[PDB]
Design a protein around this ligand. Structure first.
Ligand SMILES: [Zn+2]
Length: 91
DNA sequence: CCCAAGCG
DNA sequence: CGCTTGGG
């Protein structure tokens, strides 16, 4: 059961591991906590995705369309409008 | 110049 | 953890 987060980007310095394009400050982003090959030195760090790019990879990231949004830690803290958009985007 | 939030 | 850099 890989663990997931959802939040508004704290900054514009993070990069979407999907499209490899930088995410903008304030933009809704999703993460799988997960060791990096490069820095196993680091333990379980966040890998961030555009919700779209995330969705592209539900399988490879081990997303459980069953449980749904509830499984994204922090999902409840989002604007109602934003909460909605995701529910839709979701398997 | 400065330095800790942010990220990786 | 250590580095880069937003935000002073
Ligand atoms: Zn992306």
């Amino acid at each position: 059961l890989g663990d997931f987060a959802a939040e508004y980007a704290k900054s514009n310095r993070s990069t979407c591991k999907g499209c490899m394009e930088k995410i903008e400050k304030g933009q809704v982003r999703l993460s799988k906590k997960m060791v990096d090959p490069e820095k196993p030195q680091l333990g379980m760090i966040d890998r961030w995705y555009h919700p779209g790019c995330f969705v592209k990879n539900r399988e490879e990231l081990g997303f459980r369309p069953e449980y749904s949004a509830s499984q994204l830690k922090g999902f409840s803290l989002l604007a109602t409008e934003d909460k909605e958009a995701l529910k839709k985007q979701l398997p």
